[PDB]
Amino acid sequence: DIQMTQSPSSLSASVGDRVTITCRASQSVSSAVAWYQQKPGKAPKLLIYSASSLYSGVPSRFSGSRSGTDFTLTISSLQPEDFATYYCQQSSFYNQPFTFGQGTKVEIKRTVA
Amino acid sequence: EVQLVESGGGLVQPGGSLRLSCAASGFNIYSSSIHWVRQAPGKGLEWVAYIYSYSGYTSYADSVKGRFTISADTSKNTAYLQMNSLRAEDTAVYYCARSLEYLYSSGYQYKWATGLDYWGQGTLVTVSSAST
Amino acid sequence: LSVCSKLCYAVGGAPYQTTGCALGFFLQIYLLDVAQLDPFYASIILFVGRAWDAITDPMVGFFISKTPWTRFGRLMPWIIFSTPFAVISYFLIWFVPDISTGQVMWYLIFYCIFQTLVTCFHVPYSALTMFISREQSERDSATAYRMTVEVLGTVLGTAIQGQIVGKAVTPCIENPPFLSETNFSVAIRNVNMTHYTGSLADTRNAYMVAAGVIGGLYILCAVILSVGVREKSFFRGLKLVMNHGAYIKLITGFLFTSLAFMLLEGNFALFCTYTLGFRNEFQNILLAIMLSATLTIPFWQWFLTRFGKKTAVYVGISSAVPFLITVVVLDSNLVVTYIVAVAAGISVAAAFLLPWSMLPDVIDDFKLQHPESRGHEAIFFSFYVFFTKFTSGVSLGISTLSLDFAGYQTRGCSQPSEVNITLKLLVSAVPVGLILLGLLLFKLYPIDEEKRRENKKA
Ligand SMILES: CC/C=C\C/C=C\C/C=C\CCCCCCCC(=O)OC[C@@H](O)COP(=O)(O)OCC[N+](C)(C)C
Ligand SMILES: *[C@@H]1O[C@H](CO)[C@@H](O)[C@H](O)[C@H]1NC(C)=O
Ligand SMILES: *[C@@H]1O[C@H](CO)[C@@H](O)[C@H](O)[C@H]1NC(C)=O
């Protein structure tokens, strides 16, 4: 099994901010990542497969990148409908268990009360 | 239009038999693959099993190997997940999901990968001696 | 005449060798990988093309001396006019057709046309020697220049076709882990290919670029040859060639050895990629082989001068056996592969330099056995070259056919077990068998460094 680890586990960012979520794969190479997004109480949605390939029907806000086994997902303009939990999955048949990451809960940012 | 509807849930006794069904519409199972992925109540997603319905190639998670058996039925176009010898920690919401097999480039080689493109709605199973 | 032309006549040997080299090594890899033809039809193409190259040599050799001395010369207009069509039909071999039906004919027709035209260029160029000048010393010096340039042209063809194609490696799809039959026809369905088809178009463009570069060298060398050089029965012969038994024994021996080595050429070009798994740097290995052979040829000349030629044949052609066994016995290693490659290059240089210098000795022995014969001296070279090329074509066809029967998978990145067993037998079992049978039939060759008599009499 490959230990996929999402380094931030709770992100705070208001509408418009540049959001970045990383997912370190323990194994060095020959792995793909698949980024999904899950709303509270709804099924996930495949956002980006092959670490850079947007799925058909997904807004262009999202962008993936493979930076030396450090897969990354970035949202350019966080629309107030992107407050969900983003998961990274080990998509590759060479590394068989397609285990998911921990998750990254994105929540609005404001002054603490 | 593609649609995946799950069936089979409710309460299970710890160490019981539950067959979860995943009925498909708008596509043929015998031509495509199916993943099953569970999400624990209040935890992250956890991949459970996978099947390529044409050849019959099944994979399982390290926690479910030898307990769960995935299969596919073309006479009904339905994926199946049989769950036997259930521990009181497999209670979750199970989603079946069509895969999207693609090829990623590793140098000159084009290796195979799979992404769960369309997800089912998920059904809730509670493995417990007494709940709710 | 003087070096004012002996240098211009030299470069003319390059077009035949570069085109002939880049083909011989890479063509089987082309039709199987970037052209993606059925290995049955690829075997048909290879066999028929090399057999047609063998057939068109005496055809063209007879077609001359029947053509009149024009205002440009008699042998020169052949070279002047065959070059455009030669480079055209050579570019179209390394070009994938624009049709879905009749892909095999697109390669048969153009490979055969290129063979015919490169023959109409090489055979009048070869026969141009006897009309360069009247002094035999000048013709021998021009022949030495030409053979030097031909070896260097083998080197250039290998280097160019390997470095241009090496920049865009052929894409391979790993065996589908979710499939048992290893068929791609099922896996590719419902799967995007724009990336794979893009990489395939990249390697096809690399092959087209290499074809264009080699054709440009062809055109340039032909123009230099045409501007710097200005020139000034048979059934009985075939019945007579079978009455010189020593020549026949030399032919059987050297033919078995040369056949082994050309089998090595083709099936090793494929084997280095698919069995050993060095798909990324097999061009470097081929270039190392060719460079070792070319730099070690002069050593073999010194060896011929030191010992007998019958000792050099044994030592040189036998040096290949242990390394050819080693390369298949021990697992893949790019440090061991380079060593077996340089040893095989040395042995290749030996096995191809020895006949070229031992055949004139049987010519001199025939000049003493039947010392009244006029003509009937290049019939020996013609027979030897025909039975070299025809047999090499038959063997390459049978090799690709056996690879077809072993279940060769196109687009694959790891071939089945039977294909690897065959690629190991076609480099060690069959080639070493042929090498030993050749060196055993060479024990039946009478001149055993008794050439002193044939020399003093002359
Ligand atoms: C594993 C190896 C794979 C492939 C290698 C096998 C075949 C391809 C290579 C060559 C095929 C071309 C064969 C055509 C005839 C042989 C050419 C040859 O190699 O014949 C030697 C000749 O070239 C000597 O010319 P040299 O440069 O020695 O000058 C001589 C100077 N002098 C006269 C004073 C001694
Ligand atoms: C596998 O490939 C062979 C050769 O292309 C073909 O004849 C056969 O029908 C294929 N099998 C399938 C499509 O399952
Ligand atoms: C495959 O992906 C490419 C982008 O890399 C896209 O242009 C093409 O339309 C896709 N084709 C299919 C069959 O979806």
Kindly state whether residue A41 falls inside one of the protein's structural domains.
yes
The enclosing H or E element of A71 equals strand A70-75
Q: Residue C293 and residue C409: Cα distance in Å, rounded?
A: 33
Residue type, C230: R
Is C22 exposed, middle or buried (CB count within 10 Å of its CB: 0-12, 13-18, 19+)?
Answer: buried
- A&C contacts, CB < 8 Å: 5
- Enter the tokens of residue A82: 């992107």
Total count of domains within chain A: 1
**A105 three-class SS:** strand
Q: Is A35 helix (H, G, I), strand (E, B) or coil?
A: strand
Which two tokens mark C265? 């050429």
Q: Are C342 and C292 in contact (CB under 8 A)?
A: yes
In a domain, A13, yes or no: yes
* Chain B 39-78, residues with CB within 8 Å of chain A CB atoms: 44-47, 50, 59, 61-62
Breakpoints of chain C, after residues (C–N > 2.5 Å): 232
Rounded Cα distance between C138 and A96, Å, is: 71
**Closest-CA residue of chain A to C179:** A93
Q: Which ligand is nearest to the CA of C410?
A: 2
For A105, phi then psi, to 5°, come to -75, 115
CA distance C340 to C325: 9
Q: Whose CA is nearest to atom 8 of ligand 3?
A: C194
Who contacts C238 (Cβ-Cβ below 8 Å, separation ≥6)?
C379, C383
CA of C238: how far to CAs of C60, C104, C235, in Å?
A: 18, 36, 5
**Burial group, residue C452, by CB count within 10 angstroms (0-12, 13-18, 19+):** exposed
As given in the structure block, the two tokens for residue A24 are 């370190």
**Residue C394 to residues B68, C35, C111: CA-CA distances in angstroms?**
57, 21, 16
Please check whether residue A104 is in contact with residue A10, taking contact to mean a CB–CB distance below 8 angstroms.
Answer: yes
Closest CA to C253 of C404, C414, C445: C445
CA B43 from centroid of its chain's CA atoms: 17
Cα separation, C167 vs C67, in Å, equals 46
Dihedral sign of CA atoms B49, A33, B115, B52 in order: negative
Per DSSP, helices labelled H in C242-333 are 245-271, 282-306, 309-318, 320-329
User: Cβ atoms within 10 A of the Cβ of C58, count?
Assistant: 17
Q: Which of B12, B37, B10 is nearest to B127 (CA)?
A: B12
Q: Which regions of chain B does DSSP assign to beta strands (E)?
A: 3-7, 10-12, 18-25, 33-39, 45-52, 57-60, 68-73, 78-83, 92-106, 109-119, 123-127
Tell which atom from ligand 1 comes closest to the C-alpha of C349. 19
Contact B51, B79 (CB under 8 A): yes
- Residue A68 maps to a domain: yes
- The enclosing H or E element of A111 equals none
The DSSP bridge partners found for residue B115 are B100
Contact C190 B101 (CB under 8 A): yes
d(CA C148, CA C100): 44
Q: What token pair was written down for B36? A: 């099953």
End-to-end CA distance of chain A: 43
The token duo for A35 is 């980024």
Sheet holding A53-54, edge to edge: A10-12, A105-107, A85-91, A32-38, A45-49, A53-54
d(C-alpha A30, C-alpha C227), whole Å: 57
Structural domain contains residue A26:
yes
Sheet holding A62-67, edge to edge: A4-5, A19-25, A70-75, A62-67
β-strands A4-5, A32-38: how paired? unpaired
The CATH number given to whatever domain includes residue A69 is 2.60.40.10
In a domain, A29, yes or no: yes
Q: Which residues pair with B102 in a beta bridge?
A: B113
Spatial contact of B128 and B14, defined as CB atoms under 8 Å apart: yes
Of B40, B36, B57, B17, whose CA–CA distance to B124 is shortest? B40
Inter-chain touch C178–A93, beta carbons under 8 Å? yes
Nearest ligand 2 atom to alpha carbon C183: 1
Q: Which amino acid is at C443?
A: K
Contact A94 C177 (CB under 8 A): yes
CB of B98 within 8 A of CB of B2? yes
Residue B75 CB burial class (10 angstroms; 0-12, 13-18, ≥19): exposed
In the numeric block, the tokens 């490979």 are attached to C111
Closest C-alpha to C399, from C249, C236, C269: C269
Distance of CA C94 to the CA centre of its chain: 17
Instruction: Name the experimental technique.
Output: cryo-EM
Give the contacts of C442 (CB within 8 A, at least 6 positions apart): C249, C250, C253, C254, C310, C313, C314
Residues in chain C with CB shorter than 8 Å from the CB of A96 are: 177
Provide, as residue numbers in chain A, all residues whose Cβ is less than 8 Å from the Cβ of C177: 93-94, 96
Least Cα distance to C261 among C166, C339, C348 occurs for C348
In a domain, A31, yes or no: yes
Cα separation, C286 vs C267, whole angstroms: 12
**Residue C67, Cβ neighbours under 10 Å: how many?**
12
**How close is the nearest chain C Cα to the Cα of B48, in Å?**
17
Q: Give the C-alpha separation, A11 to B16, whole Å.
A: 40
CA torsion angle for C413, C416, C420, C423 (degrees, to 10)?
Answer: -80
Query: Rounded to a whole number, what is the distance in angstroms from the first to the last CA of chain C?
Result: 26
Specify whether the CB–CB gap between C47 and C397 falls below 8 A: yes
The distance of C174 to chain A (nearest Cα, Å) reads: 10
Specify if A113 maps to a domain.
no
Other Cβ atoms closer than 10 A to C122:
22
Q: After which residues does a break in chain A occur, C–N more than 2.5 Å?
A: none
- C254 C-alpha to ligand 1 centroid (Å): 14
Give the angle B3-B7-B9 at the CA atoms, nearest 5°. 140
DSSP state of C442: G
3-state secondary structure of A25: strand
Q: Distance between CA A98 and CA B118 in Å, rounded?
A: 16
Is there a contact between C438 and C257 (Cβ–Cβ < 8 Å)? yes
Q: How far is A68 from chain B (nearest CA, A)?
A: 12
- Map tokens 């099994």 to a residue: A1
SS3 content of chain C, % helix, strand, coil (to 5): 75, 0, 20
Cα atoms found within 13 Å of the Cα of residue A105, Cβ hemisphere only: 7
Give CA–CA dist A88/A9, Å, rounded. 12
C59 lines ligand 2 (CB under 6 A): no
DSSP C449: S
Contact (CB, 8 A) for C404 and C418: no
Q: Nearest to residue C431, comparing CAs of C300, C289, C268?
A: C268
What's the rounded Cα separation, in Å, for the pair A33 and A24? 10
Are A51 and A64 a contacting pair, CB within 8 Å? yes
Residue C280, ligand 2, Cβ within 6 A: no
Greatest CA separation found in chain A? 49
In 3-state terms, what secondary structure has residue A79? coil
d(CA C309, CA C300): 10
What is the dihedral sign for C-alpha C67, C68, C74, C79? negative
Q: Given the CA of residue C344, which atom of ligand 1 is nearest to it?
A: 1
Burial of A2 (0-12, 13-18, 19+ CB in 10 A): middle
Structure tokens of C398? 């049978």
Q: How many residues appear in chain C?
A: 458
Rg (CA), chain C: 23
Q: Decide: A106 and A78 in contact? Cβ < 8 Å.
A: yes
DSSP state for residue C278 in the 8-state scheme: -
CA dist list (Å): C67 to A52, C61, C325, C420: 66, 11, 51, 51
CA distance C247 to C240: 11
Check: CB of residue B28 under 8 Å from CB of residue B90: no
Residue C224 identity: I
Of B106, B115, B120, the CB nearest to A30: B106
The C-alpha angle A80, A82, A84, rounded to 5 degrees, equals 125
- Domains of chain B as residue ranges with CATH: 3-127 (2.60.40.10)
The owner of tokens 């998670």 is B61
Residue A112, in any domain of the structure = no
* CA–CA distances in Å: residue C314 to residues C229, C327, C348, C355, C435: 40, 21, 13, 13, 10
State whether A36 and B116 contact (CB < 8 Å).
yes
| Minimum-distance CB partner of C178 among B52, B105, B110 | B52
* B118 interaction partners in chain A (CB closer than 8 Å): 46
Going from the N-terminus, what domains does chain C have, and what CATH number goes with each? Answer: 1-232 (1.20.1250.20), 233-458 (1.20.1250.20)
With beta carbons less than 8 A apart as the criterion, state whether A60 and A39 touch. no
By residue range, what is the domain housing residue A39?
Answer: 4-107
CB of A97 within 8 A of CB of A1? Answer: yes
State whether the beta carbon of C179 lies less than 6 angstroms from ligand 2: no
| Residues of chain B neighbouring C192 (CB-CB closer than 8 A) | 102-103
- Rounded distance, CA C435 to CA C321, Å? 8
Angstrom distance (rounded) from CA C410 to CA C28: 13
By DSSP bridging, strand B92-106 and strand A32-38 are unpaired
* Residues of chain A with a CB closer than 8 angstroms to some CB in chain B: 1, 29-30, 32, 34, 36, 38, 43-46, 49-51, 53, 55, 85, 87, 89, 91-94, 96-103
Tokens representing C382? Answer: 């013609």
Distance of CA C16 from the midpoint of ligand 1 (Å): 13
Question: Residue B108: CB partners within 8 Å, gap ≥ 6?
Answer: C169, C170, C171, C172, C199, C279, C280
Pair of tokens at residue C189: 């369905």
Q: Which two tokens stand for residue B120?
A: 């089912």
Residue A17 zone, left/alpha/beta (φ > 0; ψ -120 to 50; rest)? beta
H helices of C307-378, where?
Answer: 309-318, 320-329, 334-369
Kindly state whether B129 is in contact with chain C, defined as any CB-CB distance less than 8 angstroms.
no
Select the residue from B6, B45, B93, B118 to test the A interface by mutation, using most A Cβ atoms within 10 A. B45
Q: Identify whether the C-beta of residue C341 lies closer than 8 Å to the C-beta of residue C288.
A: yes
Could you tell me the CA-to-CA distances from C365 to B79, C136, C299, C362 in Å, in that order?
83, 20, 26, 5
Residue C129 · residue C69 · CB < 8 Å: no
| Ligand 2 nearest atom to the CA of residue C186, by list position | 13
Pairing of strands A10-12, A19-25: unpaired
Q: How far apart are CA C341 and CA C287, in angstroms?
A: 10
How many whole angstroms from C369 Cα to the centroid of ligand 1?
29
